[model samples]
Target chain A: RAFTVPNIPLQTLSNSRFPSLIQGMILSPDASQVVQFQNGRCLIDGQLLGTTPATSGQLFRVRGKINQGARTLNLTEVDGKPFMAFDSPAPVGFPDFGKCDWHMRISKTPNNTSSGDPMRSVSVQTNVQGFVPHLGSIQFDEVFNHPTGDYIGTIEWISQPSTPPGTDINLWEIPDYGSSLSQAANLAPPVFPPGFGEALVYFVSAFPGPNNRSAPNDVPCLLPQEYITHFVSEQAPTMGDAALLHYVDPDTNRNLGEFKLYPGGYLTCVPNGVGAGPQQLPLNGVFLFVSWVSRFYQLKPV
Target chain B: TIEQKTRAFTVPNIPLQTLSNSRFPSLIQGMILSPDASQVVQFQNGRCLIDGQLLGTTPATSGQLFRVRGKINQGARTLNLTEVDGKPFMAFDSPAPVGFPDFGKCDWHMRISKTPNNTSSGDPMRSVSVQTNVQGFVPHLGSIQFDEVFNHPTGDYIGTIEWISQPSTPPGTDINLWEIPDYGSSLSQAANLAPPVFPPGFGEALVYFVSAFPGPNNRSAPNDVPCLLPQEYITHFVSEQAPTMGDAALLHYVDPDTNRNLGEFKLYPGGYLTCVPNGVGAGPQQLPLNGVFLFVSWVSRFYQLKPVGTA
Candidate 1:
């Protein structure tokens, strides 16, 4: 039985803007191009194509710029290219990694919005070894619960932090709903391992979440734009990077578990409410301190 | 305050003359302190130069290289080991791996016959033979490896000590501290501060302490050294992936050669503070290890020097 829990409460700003957020990979009909959103910027093939300035009607404009290695070519290259126009149901393609290619797959589906509420969840398709289902399309309403799910947005963004001087990173969070690779690969109830409790699992670009009460420890739940650009530029262009952030208690405050999301979205942490772990050392503090210190040493100071 | 001392000992294990090949004249030097605070030194050959005085009864003076007897009256009160094999002393410490011949493994076996001049609570003092892995030393990383304290065995990674560079440090000073400022927190904030006070900040430093001599053979700097336990001591935390903090994949601060235990180093919060290990037996310095601090691996070697020309 596929049971659903109320989607975790979104941050105040995200709550207002997410319904309008087209947060997925947009494959061109011919499959020659792909588009994705990180922070507020638009990316294609993990390259900075432009930034999403605003939406006109149902279409958002991508203000283009030439990303030439280190230096920007022209500051005057600010013309907005309007694409993905849709007031009603629109047509788009989805390229599933390690599965069917995005070349010929096409689907025309409207925003699976209810009444007037914008669609808040994205489809995470899984277990497609055949080209028969055109298995790469985004069914905007479905959230798959599989262990080996590999969609473009489902990749846990992680890599060296080379984000520029004054930009923040954003990370997207989704529940890993089946048995881990280390466990007997099974999918059912008992969402997490034995020691883990029920909590909205997600990752964030920075730790200590936000210093506010509204989001508590999960404010910046999405990877920011700066690190995506850096990760794509310096590291693998197609691979995303993010630091796994988990607040142990879904309803508590300050009990956070910080870790780096390994490739293919894998992570393991000792189960402690926040402060209790080996030798009574604060679990949250150790993880947070280690993660931050490791990043510090990897940096090239000016 | 200067006097001459002499010693005659047999090399039961290996021939004293065979220890030195053609390129290197003297193989080893034995040293000890007398009861009256005097110094006694013995070298394998007479080519060893101490305080501008060539030691031993030479082949040019006499060919007997086996027995070593030396005088130590330079008015400096120290047997300044300036050179060996007519080459600077530290040159052998950083020998070329290709040309140097390996001296077959030998241990200094000593038996202290009379003991218990004074009663100490801990174990009695023992002479330990430490092997030098000359091949493992990375000149670029500036780390010297005695056994496997700082170097990695697989050669894919290495641990080096490094000095921290502060804002007050001179411009263009070559420093090896790799630091990444969190855009989420203040630039130069201390890492030890709690979350509410400093938001989110993290830093780690590997600091080594030593006497403040400018060069390897200088006698003017403060001669005090930190007396530490021979074995490593590491700070660990519990986790599933890394049961002990030492077991963490990317994080490191251990002596890889000696079962990967913690090395004698210091960790610090980043920013304005001097990024070096605190000197013990001096004024006031504390080794802080708690929830607030964490450990990380390093690529650059480091040592904390003493005040210039103190002794």
Candidate 2:
């Protein structure tokens, strides 16, 4: 006797998307350089939603700089990097003095306009730890403020081995929804904590396809580009107080997992956003690509 | 001529020595009188006459010329006269030669030898002369010497009398009136001569009043001597007394000592001046009480005066 499993309809993750693979993913020979999506969306700690999508058709690239202290990965950009990220969804309750690490990226698309809008053709992918029937990859959308022309366009996605999949996480979106975004968009620029300076991260995600349906040959569902997996407890790297900023895609309001980046080991996200979407097969038409970015600071003995 | 003759009587058995020489007797040698010889007279009544009146008992002499009714006549050798009716008398032999009269016509001149108290070396017997015959008789009537008034030690009055006679009446009759020299012995030996009382603070012997004559009858009537109370005086009385006495006697006046009295005087009820002790006199007399007393004590100690209550 032959048994048949019901095909559960995939939920359209509003406001955030996680991209796991894409058509234009390229890694450098040293595995330290990569060109991927320009914008995508993801989740951090299951709550923080982030998105970095190609505006027009441009692709955003992520290239890692020299990684000296084995514990830190400093990455740079290969093209127009316009997205920010959120490190946590909820405030991480930790010791008075400690640090947290996060990951972040900006997605890309095919270039189509000279208005500096991101590319719009290519599919992107992101890696996430949690996927299930009811809770799919987080989703995000691009936000704009035509009046002020100021954009908090970057995101960070933190992935740690210790953060278990499906745990709650904090999410934040750079361009908040409704009239709130316009008001907040015009607010005086947020000051960064010392040692963090003015560094920030934002997130974006692709729109879910109609009815959340996908063709048989479509790209495999991708996790949000940013995800926090473990929270490792360690001594603080700094001597004094520090502030950590976490951005989430407005779609996923989960708490971001937290870890203390100790003195011996520090975790840093790629300075630019990461591009990751669902991996696409030849017969598959892309369904969705999502990304997330986050922000966090590690105060060290300067 | 009005010849009024009175019966002549003798002072029987009175010791009288007669000298055949016409020279004056020793008793009359240093007699002082006026230059005119008009203010003095000797009477046979044993009384001496001054200005035609009796002074005191006649001085004993063997024989002497007496004035009778303005005439000179030889009288009895001795005469009896009551002391009460006596007055002072000075005789004048003749006008002192042109310029020479007597020493200190204002002061009674005396011939003083170097006695323990006198100590003026000169003759003790000589004629005392005067500026006028009246002064010669009047000073004999109660003049006192300056030394007695001031109580000076020796010759305190050396400058008080002046000597007008150039030859000094010979050493035998040269006397010292108030230690002033060259006065005649007749003035020194005059009877009834009183001395001046020594003033306070003057440590000296009595002050004498020399006469114009050497013998008896020099005593003046008691009332004729001016009696002064403690007041009616000024400072330097001792110095002033010589000139005042001489002036009252109608003699040439001479100022005595030049030093002034260190004492002060104040007016009494009768407008007479009296001596007030030095430093204790009238104005601002209240003694200091507390703080001022202490300051005065300090000053007194610095000056070595007697402290506080010590005399």
Candidate 3:
């Protein structure tokens, strides 16, 4: 039986570091094909043939003689070099693609833009391969960035434009005005400002009711928890200082444990709650405000 | 309804500061971030957006450290944060997370099945809005956690759908949602606001989930609460130790599946997880109204050391 264990092709070798994984089928002195892992020597057999078995890398002999007709998987693929590399495999719960609902609320603190910037949401549907309608090309880079180590995979991002056969590109019309909430709140002394980019603000609302409180009962803001999340997990590398996770109460608006997400490492923090040294989580699910690094403005002109 | 429909919802995008009563008075007391990305953004009630406003053109005064926050949720209410602290935290000037990729913290909610992790070989690929997986295996909703951890050698491990922070409680006090079919504990909460706010308010404050075998069939008796042991099906998840670029290099890991397609899992570039199909004729399927979420955590990783000579 000539069955080939379809091997993985070469993938992204970023920063030219350790190329994720590499393996191949090695040939034994007996001309019989022996599976050689980077470390151990996997013997060739019926149930154990394709499996890169875990054993000693030192030369080893197969228990039985070779079967004449059967062919071993060892091949001379990579430029005469029989390489047995592992490819990116399909995740579990396969084939069941495109069966879930997708939704997102993206924001940017209007940094570099003209009087205004905006966006629109398109429809969501898909082919058997998780394909979809009119959206442009999507780019996603899944980088595992943190204090421990920096690594990432060749991520895939897909998108299409929404026309007629497509979904409507214009869902929400961006505000026509240039100023922001403070300006509208008549906080005047004149108004205030938003970011510069294709800005997308997060948290709260444009309508600042009597003194920064929620409508009537202060229904507890959800943005703090989320923003802190973005800073600590995805932005740790960019921050110049320890971001703060000032925990709060959503219902009564109480401020509890004041956390400083240090650039060092967590868990490493002792539980001695004094001065928020780390150790434990709180009881009442909290409402928090996340503060991280950014362009601190034109830094006093020199 | 069955004719393939996709709806992209429009939501909020409030900036971190300038949040006032007009928008969510019932929710927050007050909010304001320091103009510099250094200090913490204060959150209390009864404070004005003008409290953090910056002044003057040049040689700004100490009091000129802030500006009333702009719009929250792109005008009215929406998604995404454009500012960090009080500064114009634009992507161009922001610092990127450079170490291990992390699953965004707090409790980020997303449908799991069709997500990148569950879609294609490595990441999900977009299709006809009418996209579908190869085996056609459907998906289910699940949550992931990346809170209170670090980016270090032996940094804190991550969790799933953390409805709460690491509050020192077992059976964990932080209420989490979702679970495997008959695999782990349940995530049931009482709906409050009773009427329409998706309130089932009275349930236990989601502490943590206990992964028990629960009886005569599996292994021993009911294990314990929130007990998650690394089994064969899961042992591969925990990484041995992160290896940097200039190290002894990486060797592909192998397993015992007769067919390579059936191999449990594989590690892709940068340790991204690449799961394989069990393929025992489990025929293609889809998740029950869901998508997948992954949580990556650790400490500040920078200036790493490559062992002698390996560099």
Candidate 4:
């Protein structure tokens, strides 16, 4: 028997870097094909939630876990077509070095309005290999997540700038996503394996969330999109650390945290957010600069 | 200034003989480089083409080729070189005379050659000089034989001008050199290329792969030189299953040789952008990539060589 604390909010957690750990419900469960952006795995929901694949109505897909493994974790092609895109941006020294595209699988059921309204909270689990239950063919109203093939839009490719041979190719200018790949620290939920004291991950103040802020420093309370949940594991704040973002405590007349700071990463500063909630993480910069940058992202709202 | 790959050495420090590959000889003779951008050079083989004559011993690097711009002042033997940048280039059309090895009539035009093909069909070329100094060849794409054929035993993909005529409103890159308003893909006897700002590839290029099935050196241009384009980049995908930015049709740039993935490309869709190595080939050709031949390019929204490179 679990007793609930009155008024103090309890949070839900999931791994963001790996989509499979995001165990909520499907956001667009009506999609013909649900794929992960990192690897190529997909979940082909039959028809609409209540119909068959051949049926011309709204439906949800049936997912499975045949052995103890999740299938959407690895894929190259889906629906019998070429689906993987490969490239080599680095030239001169090496061609195919560190250009890996990680897929973050989100459910196909979260509904959103163009007006950016708070979405209806729905939960689903793909733990077993079977069909999500539906009464019959007419239970199609649940299939509102049919994707318009949501795209972030097109991007072009070009060879990195050629540099003088004897000198180092200035990788500083090009995007440096590769460096983060080798680090285990980029993953969410600060994992402490008996190395906290001296090797403490410097903890700092964090602010609120972005993308429908329901609370401060909180991952979304509901499955807004498939594979799009936030789970932040926390440890006792240590001396070692690092931190985007806007949020405030009108009561204290003090800045509480920034908006949309998550994953405890680095670009302009250190790690300082409770995964997109009211967790205001104090960055290396002073008050004004930190708020300015974090506010910048909150304004863009990604 | 000369650039080195591994050595901390200057132009004078490296041995000139180690560079004698008889591969890409200074085919550029009598061209003028920027008098201000000039450098003195020599060859141990004693190929006399002197200062006001030839670089007879330039010995460009394995990846780095050289080219020039501007009309010769005749005082110095470089091609046109007022303001030129170094780019991989080759001799433009100078159809050699019929019989023995002979340099064809002089109507110089140096075009930037990327996938420069090298094929030895020994195919007899017709003697028709369709170009002069500044004016390029007239109408339809045709091949003019040279007096001296490039006899590289391994063969190569000759880099000439290339122009494709697309009739459809292709969704991706809409660059058609054939539709170039003033000068279609023409070389006016002079060695030059379409500027960077030229409305080609919309100033952007998307890509795909150039693989050989039986697979030897298929990563580059056609091996037989002057070969037709063999789907090098940007797939014209017409599927019952179209790719949407939705989940992913996330591209896997693969190493066609081992039949494995090279790396990951951005999650872009459509048959868009200008791409593939350079050249206009009709002769037997083959573009080859010897090793892993991994091609990881940018997912850039902007890459403009409108004036081309500084060259």
Candidate 4, which CAPRI tier?
A: incorrect
Lowest lDDT 10-mer window, candidate 4 chain B?
B226-235
Predictions: Cα RMSD each: 31.6, 71.6, 32.7, 27.2
Candidate 1 lDDT tens digits, A1-302:
11111112111011101111111211112212221222233231233222221111111111112221211111111121122321101111111122111111111111121112111112222222111112112222122232221111111111111223222222232112112222211111112321222122222211111111212111121222222222232233223332333323334545444433333222223424444322232212222212212222221110
Candidate 3 deviation (Cα RMSD): 32.7
Candidate 4 similarity to native, TM-score = 0.19
Candidate with maximal TM-score: 4
lDDT by residue (tens digit), candidate 4, B110-209: 2221111222111111111112212232211222322233332221121211111111222222222111122114433222221221112342223212
Chain B alone, TM-score of each model?
0.15, 0.18, 0.17, 0.21
For each candidate, report its DockQ versus the true two-chain complex: 0.00, 0.00, 0.01, 0.01
Ranking 2 against 3 by lDDT, winner: 2
Candidate with the larger DockQ of 2 and 4: 4
Q: Which regions of candidate 3 are displaced past 4 Å?
A: A1-237, A267-282, A285-287, A293-302, B1-282, B285-311
lDDT scores of the candidates, listed in order: 0.19, 0.19, 0.18, 0.19
Name the candidate that leads on lDDT. Answer: 1
Top DockQ hit: 3
Candidate 3 reaches a DockQ of 0.01
Cα-based lDDT at residue B153, candidate 3: 25
| Model 4 stretches with alpha carbons more than 4 Å out | A1-123, A126-192, A196-302, B1-311
Task: Please state the Cα-based DockQ of model 4 relative to the true two-chain complex.
Answer: 0.01
